Each structure stands twice: as C-alpha cells, then as structure tokens.
Amino acid sequence: VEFEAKSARDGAWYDVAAFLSHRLFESGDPEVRVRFSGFGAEEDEWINVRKCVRQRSLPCEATECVAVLPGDLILCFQEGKDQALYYDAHVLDAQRRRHDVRGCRCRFLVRYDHDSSEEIVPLRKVCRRPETDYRLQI
Ligand SMILES: [Zn+2]
Numbered sequence: 001v002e003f004e005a006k007s008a009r010d011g012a013w014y015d016v017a018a019f020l021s022h023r024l025f026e027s028g029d030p031e032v033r034v035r036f037s038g039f040g041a042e043e044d045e046w047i048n049v050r051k052c053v054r055q056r057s058l059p060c061e062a063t064e065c066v067a068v069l070p071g072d073l074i075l076c077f078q079e080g081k082d083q084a085l086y087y088d089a090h091v092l093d094a095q096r097r098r099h100d101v102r103g104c105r106c107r108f109l110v111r112y113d114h115d116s117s118e119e120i121v122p123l124r125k126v127c128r129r130p131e132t133d134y135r136l137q138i
Contacts, residue, residue: 004075005034006052008045011114012085013075015056020044057086057127062103065123067135070094076110077125086127088113 003016015037022032023046030049035041047053057075060068068074068091076089089110097105104123111118 002056004054004056005032005036005045005047006088007036008047010083010085012087013057014039014086016053022049055130057129059127060104060123062099062123064128064136065096065104065106067128067132068094068106068108068123068126069132069135072132073129074110075127075129076112076119076121077127078112078119079125092118 003019004013005016006013016034017037017039018035020033020035022030024030031046032049032053033044034047034053035044070091070093072091074089074091075086078085078087078089089112091108092111093109095107095109097107099105106123107120108123108126109118109120110126
C-alpha cells in the first residue's frame with residue numbers, strides 16, 4: 001500500500017509521498033514524477049518506474065529472520081561515516097543464532113550493490129522485499 005523510490009542524488013531509497021505524473025510509457029520504459037516524504041516540491045524527481053520504484057521494504061520482526069536467505073536482495077541500513085542511508089544489498093551469508101527475549105540474534109554478511117562494500121549487520125538493519133513473505137509460510 002506504500003512505496004519507496006531510489007533518489008538519483010545518493011542512489012538510496014526513500015518513502016514515496018506521492019506520484020504526481022508519468023512519461024515515456026510509449027518507449028516501454030516509463031518514468032514517474034516522485035515527491036518524497038518530507039521533502040516538499042523542490043526535490044521531486046523523475047524516477048524510472050521499472051527499476052527505481054517498488055513496494056516498500058519493511059523492517060523485520062524478530063521471527064522474520066528465517067525469510068532472509070543468502071542470495072537475497074534486501075534493503076539495508078548503511079550507517080556510513082556520517083550519513084545513514086538505505087541501500088540495496090545482497091546477503092552473502094547468514095549466521096543463525098537462537099533468539100533471546102531481546103529478539104533475533106542472527107547476523108548477516110551483506111554486500112552493498114552500489115560500491116560492493118561488505119558489512120555484518122543485525123536484523124535491525126535489514127528490510128525485506130515483500131517478495132520473500134512466502135518464506136514465512138514455509
Ligand atoms: Zn533470527
């Protein structure tokens with residue numbers, strides 16, 4: 001019901017407040033005019049519909065870690081030197097650990113798609129693609 005889009009400024013993903021217009025559909029590769037949440041009109045962007053707009057990646061409740069598998073595309077919270085952004089990343093490996101009452105203890109070796117840098121992150125930094133929800137049924 002809610003959407004995220006990738007900004008050209010940093011290549012990171014942000015919540016979509018509204019879709020205002022679209023163009024280039026006749027090319028088979030349309031773009032949509034996106035207003036991002038909390039950013040006014042001044043920072044609207046023309047964004048590729050097929051590649052850079054999608055249903056929102058949701059944070060994981062402690063039980064959702066089993067739906068995160070090596071090979072998966074995930075949206076990952078990269079706390080950089082002094083900017084913190086959500087970037088596409090792929091799971092290289094998953095260290096399963098028995099949870100506590102604190103929640104999930106699993107850690108994930110991830111590789112960010114844009115710079116191929118790697119990081120071991122907890123579930124808190126992982127947002128799944130809704131595509132993987134079916135894993136929860138299995
Ligand atoms: Zn876990």
